[PDB]
Amino acid sequence: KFPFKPENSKTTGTNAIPIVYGLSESQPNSVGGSWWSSSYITTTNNEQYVVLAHYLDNPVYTYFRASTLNLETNEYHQYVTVGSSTPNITTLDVSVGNNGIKSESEDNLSKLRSYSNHDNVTFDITYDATTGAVANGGAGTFQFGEGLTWEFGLPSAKTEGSLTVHGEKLAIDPAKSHTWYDRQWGNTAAIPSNWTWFQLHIPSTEYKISAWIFSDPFRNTETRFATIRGANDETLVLPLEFTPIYKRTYESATGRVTYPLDWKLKISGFGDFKLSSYTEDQELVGEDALQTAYEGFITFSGNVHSKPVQGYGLVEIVYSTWDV
Ligand SMILES: *[C@@H]1O[C@H](CO)[C@@H](O[C@@H]2O[C@H](CO)[C@@H](O[C@@H]3O[C@H](CO[C@H]4O[C@H](CO[C@H]5O[C@H](CO)[C@@H](O)[C@H](O)[C@@H]5O[C@H]5O[C@H](CO)[C@@H](O)[C@H](O)[C@@H]5O)[C@@H](O)[C@H](O[C@H]5O[C@H](CO)[C@@H](O)[C@H](O)[C@@H]5O)[C@@H]4O)[C@@H](O)[C@H](O)[C@@H]3O)[C@H](O)[C@H]2NC(C)=O)[C@H](O)[C@H]1NC(C)=O
Ligand SMILES: *[C@@H]1O[C@H](CO)[C@@H](O)[C@H](O)[C@H]1NC(C)=O
Ligand SMILES: [Mg+2]
């Protein structure tokens, strides 16, 4: 079994690093953008799952998408459901139909909820941001496409609730579960053509890694870097070398792209990692490029400062257009 477990720390730690926003104020619908969660779950009957929930606001449409992965059997279910608009309100409550992400707390941190009521993808997961934030870029912002993005991750939030599998409602064990909640919003429609994002956990340590790889055709540079949150709020912003490996592949159901299923990362001054997708099919299938993503549970080995490590996490592979 994977050693899923929550942290029990303060969300912004010492507040000694002057990040460029307040977390709570960044959560409401009015801020726009993307709300995302990946829950690493052990149930009370000792089954393990990875559950994804994601709402995106976009000028053309909205969508909610979600998936479940059974870590014992590789059974995987996903859907994408398209909406038209996001209510412009001062609280967090985003949905398409009876599926969405909402805050159940005045601070938008102590209780958040990802829920889905779709055939073969039904769950109701709450989480509490008892976990030190990953402030991407060091202070929470970095260049993303033609302009800026703002992004923070809450890596190991205490998680409760249920997921329903084959008619059986299973209860989440909060001692052996955690949720990475990722909040991201931007100021430009011209986002990168495509990217890979890694979310990494190293259970022997407090390291939480949020790594981005994509091309910047506006500056004509390559973006390839990790933000690593360590202990005591310490944050590393490090270049990396990215190698996608196509010995194993998954062809998209859209017919438009072939995903690699293994990777190498060399994070400058920190370590190197060999990462592998847990199972082939982990694709959220949309009607266009932006609605589609490879969102896959991964495991990895490697070293950190020349000491061997292993861990798990998630890889996201997104094309905002198939004409890159
Ligand atoms: C974001 O998404 C991109 C796209 O999926 C990912 O990039 C790819 O990564 C893989 C793995 O690393 C690369 O595969 C390698 O490709 C080697 C060959 O590279 C050279 O050829 C490429 C193909 O060129 C042809 O096709 C493209 C369209 O697919 C045309 O634009 C191009 O003009 C060529 O067209 C002719 O051939 C096709 C048939 O293939 C016919 O249909 C046409 O009619 C033409 O006759 C080309 O894309 C490569 O360019 C890339 O790299 C150079 C640097 O060398 C850079 O200058 C370019 O701007 C571009 O980035 C290159 O010329 C091959 O030898 C090797 O074995 C392996 O297969 C793949 O090339 C990458 N593609 C691109 C566009 O970058 C990327 O990883 C992903 N990012 C993240 C973070 O996930
Ligand atoms: C939401 O409404 C407020 C107040 O009415 C307005 O100032 C703001 O521009 C709106 N936000 C968006 C994204 O339209
Ligand atoms: Mg909607």
Side-chain angles (χ1 to χ4, degrees):
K1 306 287 174 171
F2 290 95
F4 303 155
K5 59 187 66 172
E7 289 175 339
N8 186 37
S9 37
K10 312 305 230 143
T11 318
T12 45
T14 67
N15 288 276
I17 293 164
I19 62 174
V20 299
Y21 42 71
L23 303 192
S24 294
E25 295 76 11
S26 295
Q27 293 276 68
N29 288 28
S30 58
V31 175
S34 167
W35 298 261
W36 186 104
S37 63
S38 66
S39 298
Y40 305 85
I41 286 165
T42 308
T43 62
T44 58
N45 64 327
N46 205 34
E47 306 178 57
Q48 292 193 317
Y49 297 85
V50 173
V51 178
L52 272 42
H54 176 222
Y55 183 98
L56 181 69
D57 179 69
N58 173 274
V60 184
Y61 51 66
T62 68
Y63 63 70
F64 183 81
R65 58 189 183 179
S67 68
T68 66
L69 177 67
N70 182 318
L71 296 189
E72 181 207 340
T73 68
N74 294 338
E75 185 180 345
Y76 172 80
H77 298 278
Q78 54 80 36
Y79 75 96
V80 182
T81 188
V82 176
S84 56
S85 66
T86 303
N88 177 17
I89 60 178
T90 66
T91 54
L92 172 50
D93 189 344
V94 292
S95 62
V96 179
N98 205 9
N99 321 282
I101 295 170
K102 64 183 297 191
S103 164
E104 308 282 15
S105 52
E106 291 198 340
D107 64 7
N108 302 321
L109 290 171
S110 294
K111 195 173 180 186
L112 297 164
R113 183 187 305 274
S114 294
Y115 65 97
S116 179
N117 294 285
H118 193 93
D119 282 331
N120 301 269
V121 182
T122 290
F123 56 79
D124 188 353
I125 303 173
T126 59
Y127 37 98
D128 177 356
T130 66
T131 184
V134 177
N136 285 273
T141 184
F142 64 94
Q143 190 86 352
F144 185 71
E146 205 182 19
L148 302 163
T149 196
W150 292 265
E151 182 200 11
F152 62 90
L154 307 176
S156 294
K158 183 179 174 183
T159 305
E160 297 184 75
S162 71
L163 73 157
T164 298
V165 287
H166 304 134
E168 182 156 339
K169 183 158 162 181
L170 307 184
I172 294 172
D173 182 350
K176 293 175 176 177
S177 296
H178 65 101
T179 295
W180 179 302
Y181 172 83
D182 212 75
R183 173 73 177 122
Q184 186 167 4
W185 66 107
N187 71 348
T188 181
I191 60 175
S193 64
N194 64 295
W195 61 82
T196 300
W197 178 69
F198 291 96
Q199 175 211 131
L200 308 178
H201 305 260
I202 302 171
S204 59
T205 72
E206 293 190 42
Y207 289 126
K208 305 299 179 187
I209 304 175
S210 174
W212 287 92
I213 308 95
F214 55 85
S215 300
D216 181 347
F218 311 95
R219 292 176 173 175
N220 290 101
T221 56
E222 290 298 325
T223 294
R224 43 183 183 85
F225 83 114
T227 306
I228 304 181
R229 185 223 76 183
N232 304 296
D233 312 355
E234 297 158 18
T235 305
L236 322 177
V237 184
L238 310 175
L240 64 81
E241 299 177 9
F242 165 83
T243 300
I245 299 165
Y246 291 83
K247 293 151 110 180
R248 308 188 307 139
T249 59
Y250 181 68
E251 297 286 349
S252 175
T254 68
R256 303 281 200 173
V257 67
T258 309
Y259 303 111
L261 290 186
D262 300 271
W263 303 263
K264 283 183 220 204
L265 299 167
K266 174 157 199 42
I267 304 176
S268 187
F270 186 79
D272 50 29
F273 308 87
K274 173 65 232 315
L275 316 97
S276 303
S277 185
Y278 194 79
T279 194
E280 291 78 9
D281 178 10
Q282 306 188 72
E283 183 188 34
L284 309 175
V285 179
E287 299 189 290
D288 66 5
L290 193 63
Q291 294 171 14
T292 299
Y294 197 88
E295 302 273 0
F297 184 59
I298 63 171
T299 61
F300 64 90
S301 62
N303 83 88
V304 173
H305 303 313
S306 321
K307 174 212 102 173
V309 301
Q310 60 180 40
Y312 62 85
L314 179 141
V315 63
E316 170 178 273
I317 309 176
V318 167
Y319 288 76
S320 68
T321 175
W322 286 312
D323 187 359
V324 296

mmCIF file of all heavy atoms in Angstrom, residues 270-308:
data_model
loop_
_atom_site.group_PDB
_atom_site.id
_atom_site.type_symbol
_atom_site.label_atom_id
_atom_site.label_comp_id
_atom_site.label_asym_id
_atom_site.label_seq_id
_atom_site.Cartn_x
_atom_site.Cartn_y
_atom_site.Cartn_z
ATOM 1 N N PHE A 270 19.537 19.281 -6.970
ATOM 2 C CA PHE A 270 18.606 18.633 -6.053
ATOM 3 C C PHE A 270 18.585 17.119 -6.217
ATOM 4 O O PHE A 270 18.819 16.404 -5.238
ATOM 5 C CB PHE A 270 17.199 19.220 -6.251
ATOM 6 C CG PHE A 270 16.189 18.718 -5.256
ATOM 7 C CD1 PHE A 270 16.147 19.236 -3.968
ATOM 8 C CD2 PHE A 270 15.282 17.726 -5.600
ATOM 9 C CE1 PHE A 270 15.224 18.775 -3.047
ATOM 10 C CE2 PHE A 270 14.354 17.264 -4.681
ATOM 11 C CZ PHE A 270 14.324 17.788 -3.400
ATOM 12 N N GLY A 271 18.298 16.605 -7.408
ATOM 13 C CA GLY A 271 18.301 15.165 -7.596
ATOM 14 C C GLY A 271 17.856 14.799 -8.993
ATOM 15 O O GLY A 271 17.559 15.660 -9.825
ATOM 16 N N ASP A 272 17.828 13.498 -9.257
ATOM 17 C CA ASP A 272 17.320 13.012 -10.530
ATOM 18 C C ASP A 272 16.318 11.901 -10.269
ATOM 19 O O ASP A 272 16.388 11.199 -9.258
ATOM 20 C CB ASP A 272 18.441 12.538 -11.485
ATOM 21 C CG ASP A 272 19.420 11.583 -10.836
ATOM 22 O OD1 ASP A 272 19.036 10.844 -9.910
ATOM 23 O OD2 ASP A 272 20.591 11.565 -11.266
ATOM 24 N N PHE A 273 15.363 11.773 -11.181
ATOM 25 C CA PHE A 273 14.197 10.931 -10.969
ATOM 26 C C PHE A 273 13.828 10.191 -12.241
ATOM 27 O O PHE A 273 13.939 10.736 -13.343
ATOM 28 C CB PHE A 273 13.001 11.767 -10.484
ATOM 29 C CG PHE A 273 13.322 12.637 -9.304
ATOM 30 C CD1 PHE A 273 13.848 13.910 -9.485
ATOM 31 C CD2 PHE A 273 13.144 12.164 -8.015
ATOM 32 C CE1 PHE A 273 14.174 14.708 -8.402
ATOM 33 C CE2 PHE A 273 13.462 12.960 -6.919
ATOM 34 C CZ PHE A 273 13.977 14.239 -7.120
ATOM 35 N N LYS A 274 13.377 8.948 -12.068
ATOM 36 C CA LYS A 274 12.858 8.108 -13.140
ATOM 37 C C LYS A 274 11.398 7.836 -12.805
ATOM 38 O O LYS A 274 11.108 7.184 -11.800
ATOM 39 C CB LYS A 274 13.656 6.805 -13.241
ATOM 40 C CG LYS A 274 13.098 5.793 -14.220
ATOM 41 C CD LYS A 274 13.143 6.294 -15.658
ATOM 42 C CE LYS A 274 11.783 6.168 -16.337
ATOM 43 N NZ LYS A 274 11.128 4.843 -16.080
ATOM 44 N N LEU A 275 10.483 8.342 -13.629
ATOM 45 C CA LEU A 275 9.060 8.348 -13.308
ATOM 46 C C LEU A 275 8.282 7.503 -14.309
ATOM 47 O O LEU A 275 8.603 7.478 -15.502
ATOM 48 C CB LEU A 275 8.521 9.789 -13.285
ATOM 49 C CG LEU A 275 9.406 10.818 -12.565
ATOM 50 C CD1 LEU A 275 10.304 11.623 -13.528
ATOM 51 C CD2 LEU A 275 8.552 11.753 -11.690
ATOM 52 N N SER A 276 7.245 6.818 -13.824
ATOM 53 C CA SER A 276 6.488 5.891 -14.658
ATOM 54 C C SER A 276 5.002 6.020 -14.377
ATOM 55 O O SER A 276 4.582 6.000 -13.216
ATOM 56 C CB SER A 276 6.933 4.446 -14.416
ATOM 57 O OG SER A 276 8.321 4.319 -14.657
ATOM 58 N N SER A 277 4.212 6.132 -15.437
ATOM 59 C CA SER A 277 2.770 6.139 -15.264
ATOM 60 C C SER A 277 2.306 4.784 -14.738
ATOM 61 O O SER A 277 2.788 3.732 -15.171
ATOM 62 C CB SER A 277 2.075 6.480 -16.578
ATOM 63 O OG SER A 277 0.676 6.610 -16.383
ATOM 64 N N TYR A 278 1.369 4.820 -13.788
ATOM 65 C CA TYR A 278 0.941 3.609 -13.086
ATOM 66 C C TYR A 278 0.206 2.646 -14.014
ATOM 67 O O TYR A 278 0.345 1.422 -13.889
ATOM 68 C CB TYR A 278 0.047 4.006 -11.915
ATOM 69 C CG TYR A 278 -0.222 2.930 -10.887
ATOM 70 C CD1 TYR A 278 0.723 2.617 -9.914
ATOM 71 C CD2 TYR A 278 -1.436 2.260 -10.863
ATOM 72 C CE1 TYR A 278 0.468 1.648 -8.956
ATOM 73 C CE2 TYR A 278 -1.698 1.296 -9.913
ATOM 74 C CZ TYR A 278 -0.740 0.994 -8.965
ATOM 75 O OH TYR A 278 -1.003 0.037 -8.012
ATOM 76 N N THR A 279 -0.602 3.179 -14.924
ATOM 77 C CA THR A 279 -1.325 2.383 -15.903
ATOM 78 C C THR A 279 -1.532 3.242 -17.143
ATOM 79 O O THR A 279 -1.452 4.472 -17.086
ATOM 80 C CB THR A 279 -2.656 1.868 -15.339
ATOM 81 O OG1 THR A 279 -3.164 0.835 -16.191
ATOM 82 C CG2 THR A 279 -3.686 2.993 -15.241
ATOM 83 N N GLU A 280 -1.785 2.578 -18.275
ATOM 84 C CA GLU A 280 -1.718 3.253 -19.571
ATOM 85 C C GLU A 280 -2.815 4.303 -19.724
ATOM 86 O O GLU A 280 -2.535 5.472 -20.012
ATOM 87 C CB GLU A 280 -1.802 2.232 -20.713
ATOM 88 C CG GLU A 280 -0.590 1.324 -20.859
ATOM 89 C CD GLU A 280 -0.569 0.199 -19.835
ATOM 90 O OE1 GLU A 280 -1.576 0.019 -19.119
ATOM 91 O OE2 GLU A 280 0.455 -0.511 -19.750
ATOM 92 N N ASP A 281 -4.074 3.899 -19.572
ATOM 93 C CA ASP A 281 -5.214 4.783 -19.817
ATOM 94 C C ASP A 281 -5.519 5.574 -18.547
ATOM 95 O O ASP A 281 -6.083 5.045 -17.587
ATOM 96 C CB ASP A 281 -6.426 3.975 -20.273
ATOM 97 C CG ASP A 281 -7.661 4.838 -20.509
ATOM 98 O OD1 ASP A 281 -7.551 6.087 -20.516
ATOM 99 O OD2 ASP A 281 -8.753 4.259 -20.697
ATOM 100 N N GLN A 282 -5.144 6.852 -18.547
ATOM 101 C CA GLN A 282 -5.545 7.805 -17.507
ATOM 102 C C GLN A 282 -5.854 9.154 -18.149
ATOM 103 O O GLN A 282 -5.426 10.211 -17.678
ATOM 104 C CB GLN A 282 -4.475 7.949 -16.426
ATOM 105 C CG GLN A 282 -4.041 6.635 -15.786
ATOM 106 C CD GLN A 282 -3.130 6.839 -14.595
ATOM 107 O OE1 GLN A 282 -3.569 7.272 -13.535
ATOM 108 N NE2 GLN A 282 -1.843 6.545 -14.770
ATOM 109 N N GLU A 283 -6.621 9.125 -19.243
ATOM 110 C CA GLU A 283 -6.919 10.313 -20.035
ATOM 111 C C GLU A 283 -8.350 10.787 -19.804
ATOM 112 O O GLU A 283 -9.307 10.026 -20.000
ATOM 113 C CB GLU A 283 -6.703 10.041 -21.523
ATOM 114 C CG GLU A 283 -6.940 11.275 -22.374
ATOM 115 C CD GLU A 283 -6.912 10.966 -23.859
ATOM 116 O OE1 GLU A 283 -7.349 9.858 -24.246
ATOM 117 O OE2 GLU A 283 -6.457 11.836 -24.625
ATOM 118 N N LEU A 284 -8.490 12.049 -19.405
ATOM 119 C CA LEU A 284 -9.772 12.738 -19.422
ATOM 120 C C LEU A 284 -10.058 13.169 -20.854
ATOM 121 O O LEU A 284 -9.299 13.958 -21.423
ATOM 122 C CB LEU A 284 -9.735 13.955 -18.497
ATOM 123 C CG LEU A 284 -9.227 13.724 -17.070
ATOM 124 C CD1 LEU A 284 -9.119 15.025 -16.302
ATOM 125 C CD2 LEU A 284 -10.167 12.802 -16.360
ATOM 126 N N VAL A 285 -11.143 12.663 -21.438
ATOM 127 C CA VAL A 285 -11.399 12.813 -22.867
ATOM 128 C C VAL A 285 -12.431 13.911 -23.079
ATOM 129 O O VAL A 285 -13.608 13.757 -22.729
ATOM 130 C CB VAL A 285 -11.869 11.501 -23.500
ATOM 131 C CG1 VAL A 285 -12.135 11.722 -24.983
ATOM 132 C CG2 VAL A 285 -10.833 10.419 -23.287
ATOM 133 N N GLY A 286 -11.999 15.011 -23.688
ATOM 134 C CA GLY A 286 -12.876 16.118 -23.988
ATOM 135 C C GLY A 286 -13.246 16.149 -25.461
ATOM 136 O O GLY A 286 -12.849 15.300 -26.251
ATOM 137 N N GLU A 287 -14.023 17.166 -25.816
ATOM 138 C CA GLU A 287 -14.397 17.375 -27.206
ATOM 139 C C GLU A 287 -13.368 18.190 -27.979
ATOM 140 O O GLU A 287 -13.358 18.136 -29.213
ATOM 141 C CB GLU A 287 -15.770 18.051 -27.274
ATOM 142 C CG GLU A 287 -16.871 17.210 -26.632
ATOM 143 C CD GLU A 287 -18.269 17.757 -26.870
ATOM 144 O OE1 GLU A 287 -18.607 18.819 -26.300
ATOM 145 O OE2 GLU A 287 -19.034 17.115 -27.625
ATOM 146 N N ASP A 288 -12.498 18.928 -27.292
ATOM 147 C CA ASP A 288 -11.438 19.691 -27.948
ATOM 148 C C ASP A 288 -10.158 19.521 -27.134
ATOM 149 O O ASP A 288 -10.114 18.754 -26.169
ATOM 150 C CB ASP A 288 -11.840 21.163 -28.120
ATOM 151 C CG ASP A 288 -11.986 21.897 -26.799
ATOM 152 O OD1 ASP A 288 -11.681 21.313 -25.740
ATOM 153 O OD2 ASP A 288 -12.389 23.075 -26.818
ATOM 154 N N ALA A 289 -9.112 20.258 -27.514
ATOM 155 C CA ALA A 289 -7.814 20.086 -26.865
ATOM 156 C C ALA A 289 -7.857 20.526 -25.403
ATOM 157 O O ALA A 289 -7.437 19.783 -24.510
ATOM 158 C CB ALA A 289 -6.736 20.858 -27.632
ATOM 159 N N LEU A 290 -8.375 21.724 -25.136
ATOM 160 C CA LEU A 290 -8.335 22.240 -23.769
ATOM 161 C C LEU A 290 -9.177 21.409 -22.809
ATOM 162 O O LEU A 290 -8.890 21.403 -21.608
ATOM 163 C CB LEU A 290 -8.789 23.699 -23.742
ATOM 164 C CG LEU A 290 -8.500 24.465 -22.443
ATOM 165 C CD1 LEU A 290 -6.996 24.555 -22.219
ATOM 166 C CD2 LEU A 290 -9.133 25.838 -22.480
ATOM 167 N N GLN A 291 -10.189 20.700 -23.306
ATOM 168 C CA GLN A 291 -10.993 19.852 -22.430
ATOM 169 C C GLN A 291 -10.355 18.498 -22.160
ATOM 170 O O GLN A 291 -10.883 17.737 -21.338
ATOM 171 C CB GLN A 291 -12.384 19.635 -23.039
ATOM 172 C CG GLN A 291 -13.242 20.879 -23.125
ATOM 173 C CD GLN A 291 -14.507 20.639 -23.933
ATOM 174 O OE1 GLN A 291 -14.870 19.491 -24.203
ATOM 175 N NE2 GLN A 291 -15.179 21.716 -24.325
ATOM 176 N N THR A 292 -9.247 18.175 -22.826
ATOM 177 C CA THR A 292 -8.635 16.853 -22.774
ATOM 178 C C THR A 292 -7.337 16.916 -21.984
ATOM 179 O O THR A 292 -6.592 17.894 -22.087
ATOM 180 C CB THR A 292 -8.362 16.345 -24.202
ATOM 181 O OG1 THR A 292 -9.604 16.238 -24.906
ATOM 182 C CG2 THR A 292 -7.680 14.991 -24.199
ATOM 183 N N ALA A 293 -7.059 15.882 -21.187
ATOM 184 C CA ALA A 293 -5.773 15.861 -20.500
ATOM 185 C C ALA A 293 -5.401 14.442 -20.109
ATOM 186 O O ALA A 293 -6.268 13.649 -19.732
ATOM 187 C CB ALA A 293 -5.794 16.744 -19.244
ATOM 188 N N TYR A 294 -4.107 14.136 -20.178
ATOM 189 C CA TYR A 294 -3.593 12.981 -19.459
ATOM 190 C C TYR A 294 -3.373 13.401 -18.009
ATOM 191 O O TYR A 294 -2.603 14.328 -17.737
ATOM 192 C CB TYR A 294 -2.300 12.455 -20.085
ATOM 193 C CG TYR A 294 -1.998 11.049 -19.620
ATOM 194 C CD1 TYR A 294 -2.513 9.948 -20.307
ATOM 195 C CD2 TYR A 294 -1.245 10.817 -18.473
ATOM 196 C CE1 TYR A 294 -2.260 8.647 -19.873
ATOM 197 C CE2 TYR A 294 -0.990 9.522 -18.034
ATOM 198 C CZ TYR A 294 -1.508 8.441 -18.736
ATOM 199 O OH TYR A 294 -1.266 7.155 -18.299
ATOM 200 N N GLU A 295 -4.083 12.763 -17.084
ATOM 201 C CA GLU A 295 -3.989 13.112 -15.667
ATOM 202 C C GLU A 295 -3.744 11.813 -14.916
ATOM 203 O O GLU A 295 -4.685 11.143 -14.492
ATOM 204 C CB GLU A 295 -5.237 13.816 -15.189
ATOM 205 C CG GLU A 295 -5.565 15.066 -15.936
ATOM 206 C CD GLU A 295 -4.878 16.275 -15.356
ATOM 207 O OE1 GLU A 295 -4.131 16.135 -14.360
ATOM 208 O OE2 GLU A 295 -5.100 17.371 -15.904
ATOM 209 N N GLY A 296 -2.472 11.469 -14.751
ATOM 210 C CA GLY A 296 -2.112 10.119 -14.378
ATOM 211 C C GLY A 296 -1.358 9.983 -13.073
ATOM 212 O O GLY A 296 -0.406 10.719 -12.800
ATOM 213 N N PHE A 297 -1.794 9.033 -12.256
ATOM 214 C CA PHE A 297 -0.999 8.605 -11.113
ATOM 215 C C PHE A 297 0.321 8.027 -11.604
ATOM 216 O O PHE A 297 0.354 7.272 -12.579
ATOM 217 C CB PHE A 297 -1.778 7.554 -10.318
ATOM 218 C CG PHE A 297 -1.098 7.095 -9.066
ATOM 219 C CD1 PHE A 297 -0.770 7.992 -8.060
ATOM 220 C CD2 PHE A 297 -0.809 5.747 -8.879
ATOM 221 C CE1 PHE A 297 -0.157 7.557 -6.892
ATOM 222 C CE2 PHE A 297 -0.196 5.300 -7.717
ATOM 223 C CZ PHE A 297 0.133 6.198 -6.715
ATOM 224 N N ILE A 298 1.413 8.399 -10.935
ATOM 225 C CA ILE A 298 2.755 7.960 -11.307
ATOM 226 C C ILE A 298 3.506 7.535 -10.053
ATOM 227 O O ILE A 298 3.207 7.980 -8.939
ATOM 228 C CB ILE A 298 3.558 9.061 -12.050
ATOM 229 C CG1 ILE A 298 3.775 10.271 -11.133
ATOM 230 C CG2 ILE A 298 2.875 9.464 -13.364
ATOM 231 C CD1 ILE A 298 4.732 11.330 -11.696
ATOM 232 N N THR A 299 4.495 6.661 -10.238
ATOM 233 C CA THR A 299 5.467 6.347 -9.201
ATOM 234 C C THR A 299 6.855 6.676 -9.728
ATOM 235 O O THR A 299 7.061 6.819 -10.937
ATOM 236 C CB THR A 299 5.412 4.869 -8.775
ATOM 237 O OG1 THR A 299 5.712 4.049 -9.911
ATOM 238 C CG2 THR A 299 4.032 4.499 -8.228
ATOM 239 N N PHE A 300 7.814 6.827 -8.820
ATOM 240 C CA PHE A 300 9.148 7.158 -9.287
ATOM 241 C C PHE A 300 10.190 6.693 -8.284
ATOM 242 O O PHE A 300 9.912 6.482 -7.100
ATOM 243 C CB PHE A 300 9.311 8.666 -9.579
ATOM 244 C CG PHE A 300 9.158 9.557 -8.372
ATOM 245 C CD1 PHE A 300 10.256 9.896 -7.598
ATOM 246 C CD2 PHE A 300 7.917 10.082 -8.032
ATOM 247 C CE1 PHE A 300 10.125 10.718 -6.493
ATOM 248 C CE2 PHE A 300 7.778 10.910 -6.929
ATOM 249 C CZ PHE A 300 8.876 11.225 -6.155
ATOM 250 N N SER A 301 11.399 6.524 -8.798
ATOM 251 C CA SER A 301 12.598 6.362 -8.002
ATOM 252 C C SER A 301 13.575 7.454 -8.402
ATOM 253 O O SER A 301 13.412 8.126 -9.425
ATOM 254 C CB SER A 301 13.228 4.977 -8.211
ATOM 255 O OG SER A 301 13.625 4.816 -9.562
ATOM 256 N N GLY A 302 14.598 7.627 -7.578
ATOM 257 C CA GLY A 302 15.655 8.558 -7.913
ATOM 258 C C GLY A 302 16.537 8.810 -6.712
ATOM 259 O O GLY A 302 16.608 7.989 -5.798
ATOM 260 N N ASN A 303 17.215 9.950 -6.735
ATOM 261 C CA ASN A 303 18.046 10.362 -5.618
ATOM 262 C C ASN A 303 17.768 11.819 -5.303
ATOM 263 O O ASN A 303 17.368 12.594 -6.172
ATOM 264 C CB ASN A 303 19.549 10.169 -5.900
ATOM 265 C CG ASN A 303 20.155 11.323 -6.679
ATOM 266 O OD1 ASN A 303 20.610 12.318 -6.104
ATOM 267 N ND2 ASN A 303 20.172 11.193 -7.996
ATOM 268 N N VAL A 304 17.954 12.173 -4.040
ATOM 269 C CA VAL A 304 17.965 13.561 -3.606
ATOM 270 C C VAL A 304 19.258 13.769 -2.840
ATOM 271 O O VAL A 304 19.493 13.096 -1.828
ATOM 272 C CB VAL A 304 16.750 13.914 -2.735
ATOM 273 C CG1 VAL A 304 16.907 15.312 -2.173
ATOM 274 C CG2 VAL A 304 15.467 13.790 -3.545
ATOM 275 N N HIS A 305 20.100 14.677 -3.333
ATOM 276 C CA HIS A 305 21.415 14.927 -2.748
ATOM 277 C C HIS A 305 22.169 13.614 -2.550
ATOM 278 O O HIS A 305 22.719 13.333 -1.482
ATOM 279 C CB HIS A 305 21.291 15.710 -1.442
ATOM 280 C CG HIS A 305 20.571 17.015 -1.595
ATOM 281 N ND1 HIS A 305 20.852 17.905 -2.611
ATOM 282 C CD2 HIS A 305 19.580 17.577 -0.865
ATOM 283 C CE1 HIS A 305 20.064 18.961 -2.498
ATOM 284 N NE2 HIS A 305 19.282 18.786 -1.449
ATOM 285 N N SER A 306 22.145 12.790 -3.598
ATOM 286 C CA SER A 306 22.880 11.532 -3.715
ATOM 287 C C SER A 306 22.376 10.447 -2.772
ATOM 288 O O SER A 306 23.054 9.427 -2.594
ATOM 289 C CB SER A 306 24.386 11.736 -3.500
ATOM 290 O OG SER A 306 24.827 12.946 -4.094
ATOM 291 N N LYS A 307 21.203 10.623 -2.170
ATOM 292 C CA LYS A 307 20.583 9.596 -1.345
ATOM 293 C C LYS A 307 19.368 9.028 -2.062
ATOM 294 O O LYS A 307 18.524 9.801 -2.535
ATOM 295 C CB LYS A 307 20.168 10.174 0.014
ATOM 296 C CG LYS A 307 19.388 9.206 0.900
ATOM 297 C CD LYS A 307 18.376 9.931 1.784
ATOM 298 C CE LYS A 307 16.962 9.807 1.230
ATOM 299 N NZ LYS A 307 15.917 10.356 2.156
ATOM 300 N N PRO A 308 19.241 7.705 -2.169
ATOM 301 C CA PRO A 308 18.126 7.128 -2.934
ATOM 302 C C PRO A 308 16.783 7.444 -2.295
ATOM 303 O O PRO A 308 16.631 7.419 -1.070
ATOM 304 C CB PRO A 308 18.409 5.619 -2.902
ATOM 305 C CG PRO A 308 19.828 5.479 -2.419
ATOM 306 C CD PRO A 308 20.090 6.669 -1.555
#
